[PDB]
């Protein structure tokens, strides 16, 4: 049971760069790369006593990549695996998908090939990218397309970072987002949205860190990814692998967009006071005050929910709490799924990172659900796309690169078709 993780863009490689710090800490690997079976899903033992990760950071601008190449984890990552171009796509989907991808994707994929050939029981892929940028959006889509034509049958977990409604750092990210989804629909099997404002409000409210840099965000996102793969890495009382989300969370081949949530995100002082039990963290995983996407699930209806439990959890009280949730009437399910849940329990508790702000708690919950609020989000991005496109603003950069108006109109109607699908499914 082995899974490889590729990182596309400047956001993706900063996230996984927090992830791999978490992984080496969870498996007791000092950053030089040697130990002082459970690891084998990430680190492949090779060379001399070296556990080198199954991962490739790939990006066009060398600033952040060589930053990694000089950082603390110089000796961890295989040198060949960090692919770095010479010049950026510069927040331009056409530039990342047609100009520069055409030289970079073949090298990326035929690395991927020899990583998969070293692999034996490959479970699937998982990608890290933010669709607002240029490289993570453009050549990411090109990479997923050629990976799908390479394997197809293997499940691909896409942990994307969408732009927030009001807090935003670019101008053309509506164009990048729309063009990124148009391929994320028919290539990714399971795609998890995580914007930045939701994490901002979490870090402000629960973790009471008020000037949060990007690491605090990346740190707790790494906690979420580690939490939903701990079932593969460690034996639990009730384990679920990466193929389960494929079956149990995707009721229709085009409705695959999953809100994430985590609990308890609690500091050291708030831990010494709250009593940490199972019923209240199950409650805490359901209010929009602890979701990783700024959306209102009260306006939506759930399709299917999944609950990962880590640490000291017995099946009795998780069944009890889930009973309480289903008997509450504040939140509601669709008329299709009376069995709207899927629980999972693992033994190993979540670990602490020194310098991080999360205390060592006995247990934790990672909720991954499916709803119609995501359908509200896509319409929100669709409106602000149409406004800028009505004046043909910024279009000349894409046309100058080599793209045209055809795919703009057809990607627009594709999101309109997705909207009509969500409105048809919700009824």
């Amino acid at each position: 049971r082995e899974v490889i993780s590729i990182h596309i863009g400047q956001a993706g490689i900063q996230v996984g760069n927090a992830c791999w710090e978490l992984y080496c800490l969870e498996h007791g690997i000092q950053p030089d790369g040697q130990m002082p079976d459970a690891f084998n899903t990430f680190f492949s033992e090779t060379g001399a006593g070296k556990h080198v990760p199954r991962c490739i950071f790939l990006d066009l601008e060398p600033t952040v990549v060589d930053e990694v190449r000089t950082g603390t984890y110089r000796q961890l990552f295989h040198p060949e695996q960090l692919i770095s171009g010479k010049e950026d796509a510069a927040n331009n989907f056409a530039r990342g998908h047609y100009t520069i991808g055409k030289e970079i994707v073949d090298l990326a994929l035929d690395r991927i090939r020899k990583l998969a050939d070293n692999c034996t029981g490959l479970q699937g892929f998982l990608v890290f990218n933010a669709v607002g940028g240029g490289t993570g959006s453009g050549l990411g889509s090109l990479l997923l397309e050629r990976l799908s034509v390479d394997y197809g049958k293997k499940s691909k977990l896409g942990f994307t970072v969408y732009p927030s409604p009001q807090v935003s750092t670019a101008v053309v990210e509506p164009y990048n987002s729309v063009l990124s989804t148009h391929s994320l629909l028919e290539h990714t099997d399971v795609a998890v949205m995580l914007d930045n404002e939701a994490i901002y409000d979490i870090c402000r409210r629960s973790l009471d860190i008020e000037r949060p840099t990007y690491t605090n965000l990346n740190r707790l996102i790494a906690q979420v990814i580690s939490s939903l793969t701990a079932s593969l890495r460690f034996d639990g009382a009730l384990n679920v692998d990466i193929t389960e989300f494929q079956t149990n969370l995707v009721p229709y081949p085009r409705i695959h967009f999953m809100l994430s949530s985590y609990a308890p995100i609690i500091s050291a002082e708030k831990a010494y006071h709250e009593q940490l039990s199972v019923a209240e963290i199950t409650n805490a995983a359901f209010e929009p005050a602890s979701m990783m996407v700024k959306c209102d699930p009260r306006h939506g209806k759930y399709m299917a929910c999944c609950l990962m439990y880590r640490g000291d959890v017995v099946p009795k009280d998780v069944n009890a709490s889930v009973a309480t949730i289903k008997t509450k009437r504040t939140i509601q399910f669709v008329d299709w799924c009376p069995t709207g849940f899927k629980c999972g329990i693992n033994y190993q508790p979540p670990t602490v990172v020194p310098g991080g702000d999360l205390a060592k708690v006995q247990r934790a919950v990672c909720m991954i659900s499916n709803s119609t609020a995501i359908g509200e989000i896509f319409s929100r991005l669709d409106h602000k796309f149409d406004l800028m496109y009505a004046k043909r603003a910024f279009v000349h950069w894409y046309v100058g690169e080599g793209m045209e108006e055809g795919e703009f109109s057809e990607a627009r109607e594709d999101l309109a078709a997705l909207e009509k699908d969500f409105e048809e499914v919700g009824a």
Partner: protein, 51 residues
């Protein structure tokens, strides 16, 4: 531009309230005394064994 003066500036302005309530990465500390064991050796929350 020197480690010393750079550190003495912060040692001086540590008396500020915002300097204690907005530690860029740390977060608000509250200065509460813990019972010497909940930070490192024992984890927080109620404990009933499963294993």
């Amino acid at each position: 531009d020197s480690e010393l003066a750079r550190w003495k500036l912060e040692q001086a302005e540590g008396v500020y309230a915002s300097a204690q309530r907005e530690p860029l990465g740390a977060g608000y500390v509250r200065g509460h005394r813990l019972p010497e064991g909940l930070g490192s050796e024992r984890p927080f929350g109620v404990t009933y064994d499963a294993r």
